[PDB]
Design a binder for this molecule. Sequence first.
Ligand code: HEM
Ligand SMILES: Nc1c([N+](=O)[O-])cnc2ccccc12
Length: 289
Amino acid sequence: LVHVASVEKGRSYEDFQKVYNAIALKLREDDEYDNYIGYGPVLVRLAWHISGTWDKHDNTGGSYGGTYRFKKEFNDPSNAGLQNGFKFLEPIHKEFPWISSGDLFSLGGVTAVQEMQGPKIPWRCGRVDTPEDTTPDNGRLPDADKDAGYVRTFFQRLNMNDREVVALMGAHALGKTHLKNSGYEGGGANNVFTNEFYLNLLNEDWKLEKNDANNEQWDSKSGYMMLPTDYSLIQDPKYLSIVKEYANDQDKFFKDFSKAFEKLLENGITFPKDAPSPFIFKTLEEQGL
Ligand code: HEM
Ligand SMILES: Nc1c([N+](=O)[O-])cnc2ccccc12
C-alpha cells in the first residue's frame, strides 16, 4: 500500500507559514481552554493519535489520509477529548480550505510544539485525503495500564526503537489527563515544552494510588501524576538509562524529540525525490507577530 505525497496545487512554504500563523494566533487567543492550559497539548495529542494508527506491516492507518475526520475514528474511545482539537482547527480549515486534513492535523501538532517553546519540527506537506473506507478500525492506539514490555512491543508496530519511544513520551510534560476521557486524572497545567517529564520521573516521590475511576496511577504530593506506561520507563533498565540521559540534557532531548515526532507524522508516506525539502516554520515570536 503506497501513499505518495502530492503537494497541494501551487502551494509553497509561504502558504504553509500562513496556516502555521493562523493556528499560532488562535492558540494565543483561546487561552482559557482547559483551565488556562490552552489548546497546545490537545493539538499535540491529536497529531500523535492521527499518526499512531499506522501499521508498518501493511501501511494501513497513519496521518496521510486524514481519516480522523470520519466518524469511526473520530469516535474511537482512545480519541475521547480530541474533538476539542478538531473544533479548534475547524475555523483554520475554513480559512485555508486547500490544505488536506492530514496536513492540517499534523501541522497543528508542529505549531503547538513550537509555540510552546519546543524544538523546531521540520514538516513536509502533501498528505491527501482518502475515502471513508480507508479509516482504520479502533484499537490501534496504546493502553495506559500496561508495563514496559507492552510499550516496547506496541511501538515496534510504528517502527520506533527504545530511544524514539522514550523521546516521544516526553510530550507527557504537556497538559493533563481527564477522568471522563481516559479514566486517569491530574498532571497539572503545563503548556511549555521542556524535559521536565524525565526530571519529574526521577526526582518526585511517587505513590501508586487508585483514582476515582478505580484505575491505578502514580501520584506525587507536589501534584504530578504518571500513567503506568509512563512509570514503566523507570522500571525497565534500558528505558531508565535514556530517561536519565534526557533529564540531564535538554538540547539532546529537543533534537531527539524533533526527529522522532517528524518521523511519527511522516510514517507511511512516500516522498518523491523531487518533493520540496521539509519546511521549518518561524514562530510568531521569531516573526515579531
Ligand atoms: C504508551 C504510549 C502513550 C499512552 C498510553 C498515552 C496515554 C495518554 C492518556 C491516557 C492521556 C490522557 C487523555 C485524557 O484524559 O485527556 C494522554 C494525554 C496526552 N498525550 Fe499521551 N500517551 C502515549 C503516548 C503519547 C505520545 C507518543 C505523545 C506525543 C508525542 C502523547 C502526547 C500526549 C499529550 C500532549 C497529552 C495531553 C493532552 C491534553 O492535555 O489534553 N502521548 N496520553
Ligand atoms: N502531565 C502529565 C504527567 N506529568 O508528569 O505531570 C505525566 N503523564 C502524563 C500523561 C498524559 C498527560 C499528561 C501527563
